[PDB]
Amino acid sequence: RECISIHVGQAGVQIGNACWELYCLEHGIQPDGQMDDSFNTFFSETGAGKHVPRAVFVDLEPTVIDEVRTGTYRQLFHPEQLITGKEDAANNYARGHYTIGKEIIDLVLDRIRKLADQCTGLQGFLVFHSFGGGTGSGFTSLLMERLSVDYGKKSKLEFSIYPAPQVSTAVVEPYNSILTTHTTLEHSDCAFMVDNEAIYDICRRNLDIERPTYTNLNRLIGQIVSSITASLRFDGALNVDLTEFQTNLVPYPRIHFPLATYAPVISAEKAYHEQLSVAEITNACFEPANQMVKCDPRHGKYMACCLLYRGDVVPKDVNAAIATIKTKRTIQFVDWCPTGFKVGINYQPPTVVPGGDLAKVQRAVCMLSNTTAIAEAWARLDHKFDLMYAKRAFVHWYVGEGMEEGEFSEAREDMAALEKDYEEVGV
Amino acid sequence: AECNIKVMCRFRPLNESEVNRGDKYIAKFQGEDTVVIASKPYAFDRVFQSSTSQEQVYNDCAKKIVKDVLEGYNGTIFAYGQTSSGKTHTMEGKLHDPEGMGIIPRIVQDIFNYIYSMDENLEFHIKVSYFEIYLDKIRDLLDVSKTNLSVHEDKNRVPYVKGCTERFVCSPDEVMDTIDEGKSNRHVAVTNMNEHSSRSHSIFLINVKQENTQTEQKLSGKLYLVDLAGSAKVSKTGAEGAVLDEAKNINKSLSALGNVISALAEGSTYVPYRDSKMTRILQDSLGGNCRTTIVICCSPSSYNESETKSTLLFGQRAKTIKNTV
Amino acid sequence: MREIVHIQAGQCGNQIGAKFWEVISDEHGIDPTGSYHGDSDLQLERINVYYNEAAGNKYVPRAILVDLEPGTMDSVRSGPFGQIFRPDNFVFGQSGAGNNWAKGHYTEGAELVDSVLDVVRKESESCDCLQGFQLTHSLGGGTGSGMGTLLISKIREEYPDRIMNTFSVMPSPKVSDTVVEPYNATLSVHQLVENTDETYSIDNEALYDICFRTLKLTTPTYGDLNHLVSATMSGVTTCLRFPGQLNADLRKLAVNMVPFPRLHFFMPGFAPLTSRGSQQYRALTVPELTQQMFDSKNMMAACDPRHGRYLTVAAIFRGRMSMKEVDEQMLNVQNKNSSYFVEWIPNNVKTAVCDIPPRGLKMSATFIGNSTAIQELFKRISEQFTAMFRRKAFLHWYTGEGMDEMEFTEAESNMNDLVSEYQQYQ
Amino acid sequence: MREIVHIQAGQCGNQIGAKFWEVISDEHGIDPTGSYHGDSDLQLERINVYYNEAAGNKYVPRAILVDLEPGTMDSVRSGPFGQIFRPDNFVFGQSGAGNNWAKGHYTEGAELVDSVLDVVRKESESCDCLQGFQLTHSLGGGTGSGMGTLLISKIREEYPDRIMNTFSVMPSPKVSDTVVEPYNATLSVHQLVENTDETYSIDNEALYDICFRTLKLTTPTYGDLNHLVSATMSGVTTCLRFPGQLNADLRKLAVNMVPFPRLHFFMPGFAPLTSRGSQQYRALTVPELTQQMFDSKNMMAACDPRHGRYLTVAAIFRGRMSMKEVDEQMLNVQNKNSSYFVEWIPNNVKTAVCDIPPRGLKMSATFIGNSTAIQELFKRISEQFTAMFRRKAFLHWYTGEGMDEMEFTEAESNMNDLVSEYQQYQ
Ligand SMILES: Nc1nc2c(ncn2[C@@H]2O[C@H](COP(=O)(O)CP(=O)(O)OP(=O)(O)O)[C@@H](O)[C@H]2O)c(=O)[nH]1
Ligand SMILES: Nc1nc2c(ncn2[C@@H]2O[C@H](COP(=O)(O)CP(=O)(O)OP(=O)(O)O)[C@@H](O)[C@H]2O)c(=O)[nH]1
Ligand SMILES: Nc1nc2c(ncn2[C@@H]2O[C@H](COP(=O)(O)OP(=O)(O)OP(=O)(O)O)[C@@H](O)[C@H]2O)c(=O)[nH]1
Ligand SMILES: Nc1ncnc2c1ncn2[C@@H]1O[C@H](COP(=O)(O)OP(=O)(O)OP(=O)(O)O)[C@@H](O)[C@H]1O
């Protein structure tokens, strides 16, 4: 019951800085790399009293891969896993895919094969990237093509980071987001999305962090990925493996875009002045104020909702909680999936990061939802791309890499064909 | 005074790699002017169907430009489309055979055969050069030493190529020798989609300085016979190594040609001819006193349907443009 | 590892270049003798991107200091930091350019640029993987304008893929220190727009304006102006010199700041720029830096940005700071001031933040901006050009070096075309 | 959080403004250096409403000190509290107004107000939510009268919802310190009544009268008068600066003190105003303060309230005190003195009490009053205006700045209309 991870781009490796911080903390694994069957999913034993992740960090720019090599997590990570490039993709989908992409995939794809044969219970994959720069967009679509044709049958958990609706770190990333989604549609088995201003807004309102940096964001993002894989790492009343997400949330093979959320997002001082049970955290995860993307669920409908709980949670009260969700009319499921609910329970609760921002709670929920609410984000992301594409803005960089007018049109009609499915299933 | 830029279309037969793959013959024609692709008519001035020959295309496409450019105006003929479509076949072909050869040597024979029909006192000073754009460098084809020429404006601010080996020719047989010398010097690599993949934008200029000894009215006609490269998707071609760097400057120029065509078609302000050096020498063709006619060679296969339909959008967007002749 | 070969040409380019090495050497804690004495080990991480390791823990910059007047090298050599440079890099002629573009481009620098090109090859082949060429020159005079564009042509010829970075100090009619300014400027930009990918249009008139209004200096020497221009050079390369929450390479700045290949003429800025009196009466918070960055008067070019619109801007921040407050300020400066931003681009801002501020200061920022208002610098230079060119004054001194009148015509057409295209997207 | 941007214009407005910052800084326990050293933490609660936080636990007031004479800023800068202000806020010309309304409004201040408006935008956008603009100016002279009303027009134009608070120091014929008093006064109030929502009509004649009768001072300097006017400014804003049993915002004062939009000309007061000898012979109880508040001679305007009637009055109290004794005194002062209160309004009194008295004093109060008797200040100014306007004396100095005679006619009509409407509700 293993699952190997890869981390592409600045956003991916920055997630790995905090995501593996809480994985090794949950299993008592110090940064030195030592202190039974729980840690085998994400840590392999090396001889006697030592552990190594099944992790790969790739970034064509050498800026932050070496930062881990000189940071505090030097002994934990095997130094050959920390793969680095020579020059930067520089916010170009084509540069990370054809020029600089094609010089290092021969190293990392065959290295990912090495971890496969080292493992036996490889369930699937979980990649970490963003649609902002060329690394997270170009190199992943290149690698996903060669990883899909290599294995195919195995699953892939895509934890992408959108560009926000109005907030944004760059100008060219609509070209990156529309081009990487043209290839990611037919390859990724599950596409989990994250937004920038939403997670800024969540910790400001609920957690009361008025001035967060990116390291504060990646703590709870790793908690979200840690929650879905906690059922594999620990025992519970009703465990769910990675294969449940493909069978429960993907009604059709093209609409495979869930939405992640987490609760209770509560600070240290508010935990004492607020009681936590399954009912209020369940209703807290469905409201738009706590969704990880800037899309309101009332505009659309929930096709499916996988509720993954942690900590001491009995199995009879969850049935009462989901009953209140079904009768509440502000959120409504589709008629084609009336029993749109899956429950998962784990006895081991979440762990608090030392020096972090989140507070320790006896129970927590990590709810995944496949819905039509993401079609609004696709439309406004596709709409803003049309103004730059109409004037041929920033096209001379991509076609200078080797592309042409054609694949931009294929990326446009593919997005319309994707939205053609969302308006179809929204009936 | 003012004329319309003449857009035409041509299709080849399905090649060996296309019929072996089992590509469907999606080409459907409603007359000799419109083609129906994906249930959409794409209108052109003359749609040369798949069964057309070399002589059939030349008699309707570039037969009129011989008389236009020798009247005193300038001409420009140039092919567009993805790789393996037949741009090198339609323009050059095989110059030894009368039937297999393309539009370029037929233009050569028609001008000289036309001039012999004229009176002896009509003097004709015909100088010809041949050069290409390779890695964004103006590589001369009739000369090897000159690596990169410089773009210069004429007396009335119109861009030309300075230092080009404008060889004064006398007979048409000498012109065929110049093309064979330049055809060998053209950078042509091998690819799975196109074995004869022209990796450069070859321009073959015919400057016919013509003046009558009796009337003394001097005239000049520039005829730019250009053969562009193909807009090659790297996924289909698999360009790696040196040819990958060639694909950069090729699609950069073709996209830049798409930029000025998209800029001029909408009636924009600037029309960036200075975006690329390929667009510079075409500035007299696009926004000058030339009766520019353009054909596009398109592949009829459904495998290349994406790049094919984009060629038609480039064509129909170019249809709304009018030249100030 | 994304190395950078530095070029300095002309008296102004050598002066801003000389002070530029003074600033970043203090950022890395490098002695004037070249020995490293920095406190933090992160300074020695990416020290290779501007220096080369030598024996005895000594370092030497990859600075190719070019000129035609030997007196400029003596001032740099006798300066506080002259001893750190390699003595071999000082390639210099005997006779000055005399403020003639054609001399440095055809006769004086054409024989010297062949010797300089071998040194560029020496520093490039010693690199692991060079990213771009950081050049510093003024368009006033003959050395920086004429020989500099010639040197850019050869490097662009041999390296058609690297990032050709230039800092073109171009003056205005408000400060006309030389009668031959338009011919030096109009002919230099004829080569820059065709070859280069970055052109930081800095003006002396704006630079003096900073010293009086926001810096509040009584006697601004040229060295005070060199300190400000050096701050912009250290700001744009701060991402690829230290770890940061968002590391944007110069290629990653060029991809966002260049929506079309010719539209690569920028307008730099820097903050906090506080006087000695206003030090304690100013908060170091992030919104205070942002309002000083986008201040119309705090631009280092004569063109006010309110007269046009930004195609795309960048803000390279330095020091520890929350990303959320940076994103809100990048958000707010396009909501209310949407008239100063073109709306056919949805998001005109680029962000970046390093985890190491400047030495002595707690926080800092650096601005890049490609505005449609910048065309008036080219418009007024064309007015000065056509004013002197209509009667052909002082053109015969260019004919002696083989330069023809058509080259002035081709430069003016390419100059005027540059004015029209910024007027299109305004 | 209901922030307040402060404006100071003219010599008198800068003097009362300079002493105003002296008083409230001592209420908050703020050093002249700006560092906070207060005993109670409640002083630092709403410190943002007049100050901005700075590094090193330093604070700076949001004081935009405007003038046309640079000598006024030197006196404020060299004063006991000049070092706390930001040096950037001191926007000032070179030549004084010369006691001409048209100079400051059209020629002298019109070029300077554009620079001042950018500083108003700087302090406003840094705020969270500004409530109103607290302006201080005298209607005598050209700077406060002419440039001040121009500045009020631009701020009222950009901010048509905020509370435009002004403290118009208007003299009487009993103290005629300038021959051009009526033209400066008549033209200034032409703009104030159309734009502003508060006009605290303070008179120098009444201010000197306080010093002799109830304060019993031998040599009342202007600084003694500035201490009294500062007490009124600190009194009206005491609700929104500290916790209180009834917190009335300036909008909550404007809603009660303005029964019709033009009737917004007030008459301030303050108590306890005791001499040095009468300190021990006076009880600090609440009824003793109330009789001093409503005392006809203890008003800061030349118009006695007995000659007319109060439309609506307010009493902002300070310090610990029972609400019942306050309500009885507010009740009793309208029962027996009902002739001095219009009865078509049932209750003409507004009450408010803070839980923090002034520094050094145990209890205090502050009076606001919109009386029909206030019209005689406008009547006598109209008599002086028509006396000089009937033969058009000294009008030609206003024609040089483009001001026409019809603008004097429009001001006089709006002036005389203001006199008639207070006569209506008398
Ligand atoms: N901000 C600064 N500007 C300078 C400085 N020195 C010169 N300049 C400005 O740049 C203008 C021209 O630049 P240069 O001094 O380098 C003339 P150059 O050396 O290139 O030619 P020659 O000296 O004739 O060989 C010049 O007129 C000044 O306006 C300086 O130290 N700092
Ligand atoms: N209660 C006080 N009244 C003052 C003070 N200074 C002046 N005044 C009175 O206000 C009257 C006019 O106000 P100003 O002194 O400000 C004249 P202003 O500066 O606005 O114009 P110019 O000085 O001509 O530029 C003036 O005649 C005095 O009666 C003061 O410090 N305190
Ligand atoms: N939530 C979150 N987003 C991040 C983080 N780091 C980067 N991002 C986002 O990732 C986007 C771009 O990601 P990348 O593709 O990795 O950018 P890059 O690696 O610097 O690409 P280059 O410019 O070519 O070097 C940015 O727009 C950010 O908004 C992070 O730590 N947390
Ligand atoms: N109409 C046609 N009939 C028969 N054969 C053709 C035709 N068009 C092309 N071919 C075949 O294709 C081969 C090469 O095609 P060609 O080089 O003309 O493609 P291209 O479009 O010129 O490529 P490039 O992108 O280099 O311009 C020729 O050798 C020829 O046999």
Residue numbers in the entry:
A (entry chain I): 2 to 36, 52 to 443
B (entry chain Y): 5 to 329
C (entry chain Q), D (entry chain P): 1 to 426
Question: What's in the article?
Answer:
Microtubules are cytoskeletal filaments that play various important roles in cellular processes, including intracellular transport, cell division, and establishment of cell polarity. They are highly dynamic tubular polymers assembled from α/β-tubulin heterodimers, which are arranged in a head-to-tail manner to form protofilaments, with ~13 protofilaments associating laterally to form a hollow polar tube. In vertebrates, both α- and β-tubulins have multiple isotypes encoded by different genes, which are intrinsic factors in regulating microtubule functions. The GTP bound to β-tubulin at the E-site (exchangeable) is hydrolysed within the microtubule assembly proceeding via longitudinal contacts with α-tubulin, while the GTP bound to α-tubulin at the N-site (non-exchangeable) plays a structural role and is never hydrolysed. We determined the cryo-EM maps of α1A/β2A, α1C/β2A, and α4A/β2A microtubules in the dominantly populated 14-protofilament type at the resolution range of 4.2 Å to 4.4 Å.
The α-tubulin isotype α1A is highly expressed in postmitotic neurons but is decreased in postnatal and adult stages. The microtubules were decorated with K 349(E236A) to aid in the identification of α- and β-tubulins in the reconstruction process through the “seam-search” protocol. By superimposing the global Cα of α-tubulin on the left side, we found that for α1C/β2A microtubules, the lateral interaction between α-α and β-β contacts in the non-seam region was similar to that of α1A/β2A contacts, with the Cα atom root mean square deviation (RMSD) lower than 1 Å. Additionally, we did not observe obvious structural deviation in the lateral interfaces of these three types of microtubules. We first superimposed three consecutive tubulin dimers within a single protofilament of α1A/β2A and α1C/β2A microtubules by aligning the Cα of the bottom α-tubulin together. We found that the longitudinal interactions between the intradimer and interdimer of α1A/β2A and α1C/β2A microtubules are very similar, which was confirmed by Cα atom RMSD analysis. However, the tubulin C-terminal tails that extend from the microtubule surface were unresolved, most likely due to their flexibility. This feature, to some extent, confirmed our previous conclusion that the distinct dynamics of α1A/β2A and α1C/β2A microtubules is mainly determined by their C-terminal tails.
